[PDB]
Amino acid sequence: KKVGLLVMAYGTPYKDEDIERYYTDIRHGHKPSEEMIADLRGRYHAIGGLSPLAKITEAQAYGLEKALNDSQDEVEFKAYIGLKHIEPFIEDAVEAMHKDGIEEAISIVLAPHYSSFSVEAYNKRAKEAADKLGGPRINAINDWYKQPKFIQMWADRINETAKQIPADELLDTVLIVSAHSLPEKIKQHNDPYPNQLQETADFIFEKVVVPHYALGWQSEGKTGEPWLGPDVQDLTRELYGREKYKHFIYTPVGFVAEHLEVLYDNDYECKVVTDEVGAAYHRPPMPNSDPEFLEVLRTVVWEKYSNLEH
Ligand SMILES: [K+]
Ligand SMILES: [K+]
């Protein structure tokens, strides 16, 4: 039988007309105000609109499927995309697998780090759907930031971007390593997410020419509670105040695609700050569906299959 490959991600609106229902789902059924929707529409317009965004997630899932099936002849994987906040939902993907007669699946989230707040939610939804249908059995991957090829992918991109920088200003350059912020309360649960981001930054930093680095958070939601900090905008201001860096290199390694959180929260909002302090802004290409990144994911999934079967 084919092995199911459940590739999960947050979801992005396909059409402009989807923005309201998308953000209503994100906000637990609380429809965004007219002013909030207008703000969000303006942010999507700033980054060139919606059409490029969903294509990346598709290219990652199906590129991963092809990378797996061309690299070995023990099994055939079939990819099913399951999204948190728009169709096809996680539950749709699991239903599809069961209807197709898939008995065994491996799941992976398109984010390198584990949190009890975020990744566990995907896993719980997938498992509960499967339990209701009677299958498939789902063997979940929880994180994959420790993969050497993942770290090397980011180090290589940073080192290439660093060639943009005059030799004598490299000592005035800082690497800002970031991920999506989460509610600060995850720390009361001993959530490993903050430590996993620190480890990722450490592993990358020892492989790059940039001599200074800092960890930050971004893209925090608006709920009634504090979120992990510092936010990259505030951290940029603070680091300039203390050290007067001339170059900021932003690697939002918690993200895998050029979606709104990178094209707006970094390329607009962080560049506003670097502009305001007279420093230069740099941000390497995101992984998207680059063959090097597809090979990272292939390595992750095949290592999981191998551990289960070999
Ligand atoms: K678990
Ligand atoms: K914090």
Author numbering: 3 to 312
Task: Copy out sentences from the published article reporting this entry, exactly as the authors wrote them.
Diffraction data for apo- and coproheme-LmCpfCs were collected to 1.64 Å resolution. Structures were solved with molecular replacement using BsCpfC, the structurally best studied representative from Firmicutes ferrochelatases, as a search model, and refined to Rfree values of 0.2013 (apo-LmCpfC) and 0.2014 (coproheme-LmCpfC); for complete data collection and refinement statistics, please see Table 1. In the apo-structure, the substrate/product binding site is occupied by solvent molecules (phosphates and glycerols). Interestingly, the orientation of Glu263 is notably different compared to the product bound, pointing away from the His182. In the apo-protein, the active site (i.e., coproporphyrin III binding site) is filled with solvent molecules that are released upon binding of the macrocycle as seen in the crystal structures of apo-LmCpfC and coproheme-LmCpfC. In the apo-structure, the side chain of Ser53 is solvent exposed, while in the product-bound form, it points to the inner core of the protein, due to the interaction with p4. Similarly, Arg45 (H-bond to p6) adopts a notably different conformation in the apo-structure compared to the coproheme-bound structure, even though it is hydrogen bonded to Asp41 in both cases. The H-bonding pattern changes from one H-bond in the apo-form to a bidentate binding to the guanidinium group in the holo form. CAVER calculations of the putative substrate channels in apo- and coproheme-LmCpfC show that the throughput (throughput values range from 0 to 1; the higher the value, the greater the importance of the tunnel) for the two calculated main channels in the apo-structure is higher than for the coproheme structure (apo: 0.867 and 0.799; coproheme: 0.832 and 0.757). Additionally, the bottleneck radii for channels in apo-LmCpfC are larger (2.6 and 2.3 Å) than in coproheme-LmCpfC (2.2 and 2.0 Å).
